[PDB]
Amino acid sequence: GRGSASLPACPEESPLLVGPMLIEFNMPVDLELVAKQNPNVKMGGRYAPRDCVSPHKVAIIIPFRNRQEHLKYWLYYLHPVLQRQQLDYGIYVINQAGDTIFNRAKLLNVGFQEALKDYDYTCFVFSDVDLIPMNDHNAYRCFSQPRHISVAMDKFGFSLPYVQYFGGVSALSKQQFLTINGFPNNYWGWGGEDDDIFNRLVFRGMSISRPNAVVGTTRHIRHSRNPQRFDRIAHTKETMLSDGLNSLTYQVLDVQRYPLYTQITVDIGTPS
Numbered sequence: 616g617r618g619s620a621s622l623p624a625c626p627e628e629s630p631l632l633v634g635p636m637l638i639e640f641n642m643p644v645d646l647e648l649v650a651k652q653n654p655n656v657k658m659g660g661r662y663a664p665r666d667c668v669s670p671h672k673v674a675i676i677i678p679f680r681n682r683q684e685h686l687k688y689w690l691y692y693l694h695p696v697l698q699r700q701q702l703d704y705g706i707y708v709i710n711q712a713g714d715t716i717f718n719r720a721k722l723l724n725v726g727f728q729e730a731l732k733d734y735d736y737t738c739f740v741f742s743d744v745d746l747i748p749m750n751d752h753n754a755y756r757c758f759s760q761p762r763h764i765s766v767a768m769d770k771f772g773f774s775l776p777y778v779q780y781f782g783g784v785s786a787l788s789k790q791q792f793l794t795i796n797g798f799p800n801n802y803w804g805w806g807g808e809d810d811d812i813f814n815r816l817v818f819r820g821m822s823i824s825r826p827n828a829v830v831g832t833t834r835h836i837r838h839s840r841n842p843q844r845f846d847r848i849a850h851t852k853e854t855m856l857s858d859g860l861n862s863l864t865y866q867v868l869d870v871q872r873y874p875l876y877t878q879i880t881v882d883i884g885t886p887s
């Protein structure tokens with residue numbers, strides 16, 4: 616019964632998952648130690664199973680600016696999880712250059728476009744750097760519909776702010792992201808960019824996929840520095856096709872590949 620054969624696809628659900636995890640942010644993290652503890656993660660924070668092929672080719676995009684301690688906790692907790700989930704993944708920290716108002720959604724668009732230059736990713740997880748999953752059955756990859764991953768956040772009492780809430784951590788396949796023309800580029804701290812994204816999905820006929828709440832619990836990291844739904848539905852319809860990936864403009868000032876992640880420093884301009 617011999618002959619040349621391809622590696623099998625990885626199983627529908629990984630047999631390596633452990634379920635609940637204790638998430639704490641009160642101890643120091645040393646990334647050199649984390650790298651040594653995750654020897655299979657390659658330069659730039661890249662990993663893929665050795666014994667099976669994953670259909671999940673995921674770029675994990677993290678909007679960022681001056682929050683190194685949070686990022687260290689993020690890397691410490693997620694790398695082991697992402698490997699147990701048997702994903703073919705890469706970590707991208709999109710660092711906003713300058714001191715102008717932070718623009719989360721625009722940095723996510725940057726991450727989508729830059730990660731694609733590195734590899735043919737077909738799934739994108741957009742994650743704030745201060746959100747950590749409490750259960751590894753919460754899959755960091757894409758589904759038949761846009762996926763909302765951080766569904767029961769401790770900062771919100773482990774309950775969804777509202778059924779249309781799409782903030783924190785989410786995942787869109789390449790097809791899903793492209794069809795909504797990505798995310799809006801003009802929410803300069805205005806708040807509600809996630810609601811605009813939700814409106815884009817609905818308008819294109821998509822719905823929200825969510826893991827069961829029991830495994831969707833996430834912890835939020837506090838920093839020395841419940842949400843309500845913003846409207847702008849009519850604005851989204853009017854603006855989505857002219858404001859997003861197609862109109863995205865930015866300058867890449869630095870690209871650093873570290874053992875556990877790639878950091879792309881970009882100048883995304885100032886509010887126009």
Ligand SMILES: [Mn+2]
Binds near residue numbers: 835
């Ligand atoms: Mn926060």
